């Protein structure tokens, strides 16, 4: 067991292994407070994350259980990784705090989109790595849910690593009006047609891809309908086929009250991108989920070609998430969750 020591940082006790130096306040959500440090066995500036409440409810306790397995389990080039997990508990009886740490992120794409100028070979190997990554959280049956620019960290070598996975946080007040938190959603989950599945995420990929190509949003919608009236005009109105997997009988009425539109030509919209770039956004900007590329098919696409190589794109270990239909007591959870901080064995 290390050492511990104490501080206050804005009005938050923090309670540290010694390896841990020069803790500075970054930010703090509703989940928890986030500190920049230095850690002297690895030499990295790292991110360590104090988990606020995180036993309080069996949802909160439940959310814990879940984030550590799903950090525990990412061990991709283009992935946000774990480097520790602690408590200053020495035993279940007193566990109360869990400190989750990782590489301290800089820049994330908002802070290259908005303010740095882009080539097509710039498009090429960020959209090559979101990718790269995708392709490994999918072959674990992960769904990430909420990919858009400022979950995207990125360097001055361009390199790119995937961050903060939706663990079902998102509530109706944070998706309302004219907010950056909607506008990469798939129109499918936007508005609760269908059970979704993986394919949610390369809609995502569609919106950022285009954003990168002409530096404006692509569907930056004042509420749900204006952004779906925006994603209706480019791809076209439903069919028969599509109308008969939407679930809801009114979400069903309410598409057939609008006018019939056709899919708008690509070109004339992207006008001056590379012809396999359009190409591309043509496949992943699909209303029908079932018909959308898979990020698989996606790298091997030619636009791709300076990139692309089929062994250097790993796939995950296999990912028992059996606990998501399984019914226990904050104790319960808390004990499962304990476990997973003692058994962490860090990376090389
Ligand atoms: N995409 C993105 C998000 C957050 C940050 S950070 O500068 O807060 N750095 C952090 C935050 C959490 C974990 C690691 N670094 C940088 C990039
Ligand atoms: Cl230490
Ligand atoms: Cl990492
Ligand atoms: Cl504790
Ligand atoms: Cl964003
Ligand atoms: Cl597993
Ligand atoms: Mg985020």
Same mark, same amino acid.
């Given at each position: 067991?290390? #050492?511990?020591? /104490?501080?206050?940082?804005? *009005? #938050? ?36 994350? *104090? ?26 080039? !283009? ?30 794409? !908002? ?5 740095? *100028? ?26 990430? /849910? ?29 998706? #309302? ?22 394919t949610?995420?390369i809609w995502?990929?569609g ?25 209706? /005009?480019?791809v ?6 599509l109308?008969? *997997? ?17 899919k ?9 991108? !590379? ?7 043509e496949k992943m900007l699909v209303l029908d989920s079932d018909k959308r590329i ?31 239909? /399984? ?22």
């Open positions: 067991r290390p #050492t511990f020591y /104490r501080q206050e940082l804005n *009005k #938050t006790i923090w309670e540290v292994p010694e390896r841990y130096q020069n803790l500075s306040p970054v930010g703090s959500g509703a989940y928890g407070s986030v500190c920049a440090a230095f850690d002297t066995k690895t030499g990295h500036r790292v991110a360590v994350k *104090k988990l606020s409440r995180p036993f309080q409810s069996i949802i909160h306790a439940k959310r814990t259980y879940r984030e550590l397995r799903l950090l525990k389990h990412m061990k991709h080039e !283009n992935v946000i990784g774990l480097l520790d997990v602690f408590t200053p508990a020495r035993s279940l009886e007193e566990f109360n705090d869990v400190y989750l740490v990782t590489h301290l992120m800089g820049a994330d794409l !908002n802070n290259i989109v908005k303010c740095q *100028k882009l080539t097509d070979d710039h498009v090429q190997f960020l959209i090559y790595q979101i990718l790269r990554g995708l392709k490994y959280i999918h072959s674990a049956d992960i769904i990430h /849910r909420d990919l858009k620019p400022s979950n995207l960290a990125v360097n001055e070598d361009c390199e790119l690593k995937i961050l903060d996975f939706g663990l079902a946080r998102h509530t109706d007040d944070e998706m #309302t009006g004219y907010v950056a938190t909607r506008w990469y959603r798939a129109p499918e989950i936007m508005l609760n047609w269908m059970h979704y599945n993986q949610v995420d995502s990929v919106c950022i891809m285009a954003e990168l190509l002409t530096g404006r949003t692509l569907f930056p919608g004042t509420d749900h309908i204006d952004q779906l009236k925006l994603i209706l /005009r480019l076209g109105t439903p069919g028969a086929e109308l008969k *997997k939407i679930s809801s009988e009114s979400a069903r009425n309410y598409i057939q009250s609008l006018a019939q539109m056709p708008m030509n690509f070109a004339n919209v992207f006008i001056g991108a !590379n012809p396999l770039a359009v190409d591309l956004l898979t990020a698989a098919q996606a790298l091997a696409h030619a636009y791709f070609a300076q990139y692309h190589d089929p062994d250097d794109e790993p796939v995950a270990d296999p990912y028992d998430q059996s606990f998501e239909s /399984r019914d226990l007591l904050i104790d319960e959870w808390k004990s499962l969750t304990y476990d997973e901080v003692i058994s962490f064995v860090p990376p090389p």
